[PDB]
Amino acid sequence: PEMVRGQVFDVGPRYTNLSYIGEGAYGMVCSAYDNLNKVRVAIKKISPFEHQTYCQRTLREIKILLRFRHENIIGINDIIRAPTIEQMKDVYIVQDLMETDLYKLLKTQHLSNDHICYFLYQILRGLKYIHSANVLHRDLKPSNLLLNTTCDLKICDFGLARVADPDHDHTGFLTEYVATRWYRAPEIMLNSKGYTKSIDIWSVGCILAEMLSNRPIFPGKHYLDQLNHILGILGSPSQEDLNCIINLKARNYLLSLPHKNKVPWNRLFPNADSKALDLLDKMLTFNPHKRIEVEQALAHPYLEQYYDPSDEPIAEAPFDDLPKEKLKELIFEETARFQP
């Protein structure tokens, strides 16, 4: 039973020569040598069974990643756990080993325009598949974009993912939300539960802005500060866009604000490709019904050297109340195919 940083990392004998990488949501992430496939892999240790919420996100991630098969979405290669529910205290998810992620990369590396274009293409190609399965990722951000040494990009962490539900998207003003603050669309704070595909496009727009300058475009320090930042750049919403917000508390909040002018993208990003900024503007559109969709974004002139719909595949088969005991049982069943 191998140990890393003083805790159990129980993956042998197939996987040996372990190296710590970092901290996942429910445990440690290590690299290891796959003695069968003769390559180093990543292994995530996950310990969710004490908490219903952890079990939920774990079941979501396993179920979605096992059903998806796409070049720009991380796969699950193997799942290691004990042979019985009684003995299962942890689960290990084995994935392709990716050199870095976009969050780590952006801390020290300036991206060429060619890299930004290629990364954005791969993000949207993966997202097209996700959305085509009627799934919302709901936590897209640089740290959930993995990169290998040849800059192949794979979306990961579907722990907050949901099936799209636009008929039930409406909610009140300042309704609490889980996903990462800096990448939250303005409507989350106003009247949206994040059950439509436009929630993900907003996050991608934030990611594009961040690739252009190595800094988050909207770094709110708390829930309502996030909306301040968004409106400080987009300016005041139009009457038409306000008229789409029927909730009085949210609409009157916006009406209470002094007028703010839009900040031109090319003043924020004077080095950027003008076509990139045109696409950025369409992803960071205030009104979620006017916001560009993933297939339109792929067809945008900025991505012309990569766009090819026949090489941008969709899913064959599109897709909170359960106690942790049933969820542990479902996780055990979902991982059985890798036993042996």
Ligand SMILES: [N-]=[N+]=NC[C@H]1O[C@@H](n2cnc3c(N)ncnc32)[C@H](O)[C@@H]1O
């Ligand atoms: N998840 N997570 N975060 C903890 C660390 O694990 C890293 N990580 C997650 N999945 C992989 C992966 N598949 N390959 C390499 N590193 C990975 C991620 O970049 C963080 O530095």
